[PDB]
Structure formats: structure tokens, C-alpha cells
Design a protein around this ligand. Structure first.
Ligand code: UDP
Length: 534
């Protein structure tokens, strides 16, 4: 009865709860709490309402969100797998179920869910998440469709600020928006670049628009003093847009992209004359408000340009910068790392959702064919590790040859690579920041460059480093090269010594050179839009 009132408030938080004071009510109150970040409670409420209606998908989905946001991953799963049974044709639910299964390495009916979602993307319905879709075996064409759809909806609900232009007066003001400034891939990849730019391109005024508070990391601090860092974490999308506009940013970069907060509306409001997509979301934004994408000759080749909605820009070398100031400490012994003191250590520290059936089979094939080797993986959420040991076994490999490392603070995690002999990349979503973490350490990465940007990032690093032999043609060749390198320790040792040379000889880790190319690109870009210099 009085219920319909409560709902509308979502679009007054406490005025709503006031209404819910009166079931599909236990559920609504539960949803109120979930809005109030009080996840623990919201899960208790929805858990109740779900027992009172174990066949009401509206409630099962809502309970799932709460359980997830309350850190109860495994249980949250069953919640979505249930909201799926009770409403098999709703793609929105299928999309979410699929994404959570991947993260847990639950591959039951994987191909069928994947098909439904890709199909949903093609019908333009289902509102599937672009970042989540990167884990699917979809082509660059499918990805573009997925992105546009999300972009066009956002574009519809927003009225752009008053139009402006690049100054033509200079200094040029370049802005960067991210939720990752410090102890997150984004900050980790750009610190050395910003420090280099501050020192080598004083003419270029760097502005960082952080949508996350200070986390106490050295990275956040370094970024803060290597640019003008604005903490706009508390502003809404409009205020944030007006704030960037208030600073007269000429070239604005989206370092959040789809997924990871991102604040998509902030960019839709077009607060800056020129907006660039770079280094955050490894795909096309497919958005009307995004002018350019910054890739490179390898990861974003001509044959791929058609799928990018924005105009393609390329840097001379690889598109990805890196923190070249990181000292790689010594890890604990192999034993203290749960690793056999003898034998070849093959590793893949990628996020669990990048660990699909195909990639896992690939890695296991190497173990099965090379005795005494082990697979060092990054421990996943829920019971992912358990499912993986199981799969390994079902694949003919002693499940005990898989060693799982817990997520560690960057410095400590970085040091673990010294025990690695070869990094095995995943497909179709490569290791990106993880790929360069390994290379920086001196650990070679083996990859199978695909046909989508996200499936060619590790390849771009290898290419630009000079290690083209590590960019093989397919799974068969992938297993071959691994087994070859694994079987002959003289070769492995030779490959490590070779990476160490190319590392120092190649531009890939020369941030001073990157700062110049990048700066040169920013000025040319500005001049193309009216800037005259000074
Ligand atoms: O034990 C670990 C494992 C990973 N990472 C970092 O976690 C982030 C991984 O993010 P993600 O997998 O999302 O990024 P990508 O590989 O796609 O660039 C990277 O900064 C890794 O350096 C870490 O600090 N400790």
C-alpha cells in the first residue's frame, strides 16, 4: 500500500525508510540499508525476505547484491544463480550471474551464459557491463556495440555544459580523472610519468582529478606532489564537471573508463573541449563525448581502428607507462612462499576472471608435459582456488602442483617474481599492469596476441621490448614454447639474461623519453584544436 512511496525516494534516503515503515517490505527495508552502505544488515533483512519467498527473483537478486557487498561471495553466488532460475530470460540477471561465476572460476554452463550475454549485447538489451564483457570471447565488433549502448543511454540522460575551446594562449592544462590514484593500477602506472613530466615539461600544467580519498600510500603522495591533485571525491557528477570546467582544462583524460566507479556522467557533461580515452579501460569507450583514444602501433593496429568510436592516437613506443622507480626487493625463500625448492616455477598472477577454461587448460598442458614444474597463481575469491585445483585434477595434473599466493602489498608481491621462471599470460583478457610488473622484474611473459586491444597488451610490451619470440600464434604454440623453455634451463637462463638487456636498451621503461613523446603528442593535439603556444 504505502510502499510505492518509498521506492520513488531512491530517485530521500531516510524519507524512503520512513515510508517502508509498515513481506516485500522486509525486502525494501533491506534494500534501503544496502543503499546506506550498511551491507551487513541489508543482507540479514533480504536473507529473511528471501526465505519468506524462496521463489521471488526480485528479492533473490537484491539479496545477492547485499551478500556480495557484504563480502560473502560464495553465498552471493547462489543468490544470483537462483534469480536466474526464476527468470531465465532476463539478460540483466544473466549478465551479473555470469560475471560473478567467472570471478569465482565456476564454469558451470559457462558457454551457455556467455552466449546469452553476447546475444543480449547484440539485441542491445540486458545492459551488460562493458568492463565485464572484456572477459568474454567476443570480437572487437561486439565490444564496440556493448560500449555504445551504455554510452548512448548515459548520453540521453545528460545535458552537456556550455561549449568551450582549447586556450590558444598556453600553458596547456591537462586533466586526468581516476579513482585509482595510489595503490591501484592507474596510479601505479602513471606516477613515474607525472614525475618525469613535471621535471621535463614544466610548460605543461598537470591536473589530477581524484575521485577517491587519500589511502595513505606512497603513490598517492607522490602523485599529489608531482601535479596539482584535486580531491573531488565528495562532488556529484555535475559539480565535478563544473569543477574541471572551472580550472579551464583543455585536454582531459579518462583514467577510469567503464568500470571502477568511473563517474561516466562527468565526461558526458563535456567539461573540456578535448577528451581522451587512455590507459584505464582496455577497449573503445564507444561514447559520443570521447574524442580520442591513445594506443600504440601494436596493441591498436590499423586493422582495429574501425572498432574504436574515437579517433585513434598513438605514441611512438608502447602505450603503457610504468613506475620505473620501483626497487624489487628479495622475496622469502621458495619454501616460505609455499614453492618446492626444486623445479621450474611457471606463474600467472592475473585476476581470477581472466582465468577462463581456455587459459587454464593451456597452463595445465605445460605442467602435464613438463615434470617437476608448478603453477603459481594469485589466490582467488570464494572457493575459486578449490574449483581450480579440481579442474587441474580433472585435466590430468596433481592438484598439489598449483600454488596459490594471497594478495600482498605491491612491494612484497613484486618481489615474488624473482622466484618465477616464466609468466604465462591469459586470453582474451591479458595481464596489463600485471604484465609490466613481471617484465620490470625481469620475468619473461609468454602471450598469444589476439584480435582485440585487451588481448594484445602483453604482446605490445613484448614487441616494444624486443621479445617477439614470446608472442606466439596460438595455444599449441603457446604450450610448445613454454615446454621448450621449461625443459631447457640453459634456455630459460638465457631468456632471463636477454630480458635484462632489452629492459635497459628498450624505450619501454624509459619514462623520460615517454614524458617527451607524450608531451609532444599533447602539444600537437592542442595545436590541432586552436592552441598557438606560449
Ligand atoms: O598480490 C598482488 C597482486 C596484484 N597486485 C596489483 O594488483 C593490481 C592488479 O590489477 P588488475 O589485475 O585489475 O590490473 P591489470 O592486470 O588488468 O592491469 C596491479 O596493480 C598489481 O600490481 C598487487 O599489488 N599485489
Amino acid at each position: 500500500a504505502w510502499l510505492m512511496l518509498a521506492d520513488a525516494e531512491l530517485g530521500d534516503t531516510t524519507a524512503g525508510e520512513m515510508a517502508v515503515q509498515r513481506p516485500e517490505a522486509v525486502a525494501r527495508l533491506g534494500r534501503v540499508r544496502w543503499t546506506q552502505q550498511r551491507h551487513a544488515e541489508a543482507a540479514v533483512l533480504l536473507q529473511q525476505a528471501s526465505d519468506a519467498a524462496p521463489e521471488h527473483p526480485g528479492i533473490a537478486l537484491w539479496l545477492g547484491h547485499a551478500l556480495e557487498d557484504a563480502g560473502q561471495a560464495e553465498a552471493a553466488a547462489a543468490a544470483y544463480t537462483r534469480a536466474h532460475q526464476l527468470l531465465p530470460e532476463e539478460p540483466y540477471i544473466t549478465a551479473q550471474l555470469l560475471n560473478w561465476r567467472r570471478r569465482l572460476c565456476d564454469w558451470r554452463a559457462l558457454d551457455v551464459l556467455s552466449a546469452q550475454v553476447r546475444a543480449a549485447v547484440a539485441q542491445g538489451v540486458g545492459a551488460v557491463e562493458p568492463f565485464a564483457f572484456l572477459s568474454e570471447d567476443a570480437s572487437a565488433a561486439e565490444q564496440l556495440a556493448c560500449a555504445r549502448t551504455r554510452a548512448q543511454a548515459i548520453a540521453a540522460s545528460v545535458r552537456p555544459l556550455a561549449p568551450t575551446r582549447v586556450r590558444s594562449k598556453g600553458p596547456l592544462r591537462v586533466g586526468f580523472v581516476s579513482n585509482g590514484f595510489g595503490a591501484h593500477p592507474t596510479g601505479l602506472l602513471t606516477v613515474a610519468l607525472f614525475e618525469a613530466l613535471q621535471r621535463r615539461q614544466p610548460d605543461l600544467q598537470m591536473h589530477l582529478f581524484a575521485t577517491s580519498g587519500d589511502d595513505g600510500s606512497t603513490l598517492r603522495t607522490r602523485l599529489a606532489q608531482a601535479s596539482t591533485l584535486h580531491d573531488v571525491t565528495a562532488l556529484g557528477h555535475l559539480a565535478t564537471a563544473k569543477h574541471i570546467r572551472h580550472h579551464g582544462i583543455d585536454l582531459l583524460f579518462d583514467l577510469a573508463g567503464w568500470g571502477g566507479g568511473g563517474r561516466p556522467e562527468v565526461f558526458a557533461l563535456r567539461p573540456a573541449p578535448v577528451q581522451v580515452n587512455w590507459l584505464a579501460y582496455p577497449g573503445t569507450s564507444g561514447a559520443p563525448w570521447m574524442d580520442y583514444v591513445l594506443g600504440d602501433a601494436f596493441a591498436l593496429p590499423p586493422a582495429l581502428e574501425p572498432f574504436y568510436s574515437e579517433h585513434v592516437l598513438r605514441l611512438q613506443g608502447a602505450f603503457q607507462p610504468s613506475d620505473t622507480s620501483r626497487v624489487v626487493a628479495e622475496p622469502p625463500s621458495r619454501t616460505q612462499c609455499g614453492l618446492p625448492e626444486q623445479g621450474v616455477v611457471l606463474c600467472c598472477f592475473n585476476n581470477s576472471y581472466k582465468l577462463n577454461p581456455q587459459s587454464m587448460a593451456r597452463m595445465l598442458a605445460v605442467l602435464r608435459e613438463v615434470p617437476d614444474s608448478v603453477l603459481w597463481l594469485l589466490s582467488g575469491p570464494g572457493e575459486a582456488d578449490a574449483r581450480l585445483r579440481a579442474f587441474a585434477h580433472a585435466q590430468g595434473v596433481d592438484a598439489q602442483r598449483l600454488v596459490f599466493m594471497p594478495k600482498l602489498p605491491h612491494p612484497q608481491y613484486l618481489a615474488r617474481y624473482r622466484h618465477a621462471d616464466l609468466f604465462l599470460d591469459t586470453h582474451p583478457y591479458n595481464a596489463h599492469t600485471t604484465a609490466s610488473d613481471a617484465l620490470w622484474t625481469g620475468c619473461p611473459v609468454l602471450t598469444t596476441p589476439g584480435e582485440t586491444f585487451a588481448a594484445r597488451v602483453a604482446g605490445s610490451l613484448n614487441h616494444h621490448l624486443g621479445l617477439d619470440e614470446m608472442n606466439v600464434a596460438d595455444d599449441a604454440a603457446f604450450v610448445a614454447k613454454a615446454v621448450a623453455l621449461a625443459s631447457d634451463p640453459a634456455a630459460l637462463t638465457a631468456l632471463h639474461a636477454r630480458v635484462d638487456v632489452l629492459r635497459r636498451a628498450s624505450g619501454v621503461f624509459h619514462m623520460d623519453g615517454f614524458a617527451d613523446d607524450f608531451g609532444a603528442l599533447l602539444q600537437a593535439l592542442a595545436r590541432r584544436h586552436g592552441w598557438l603556444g606560449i
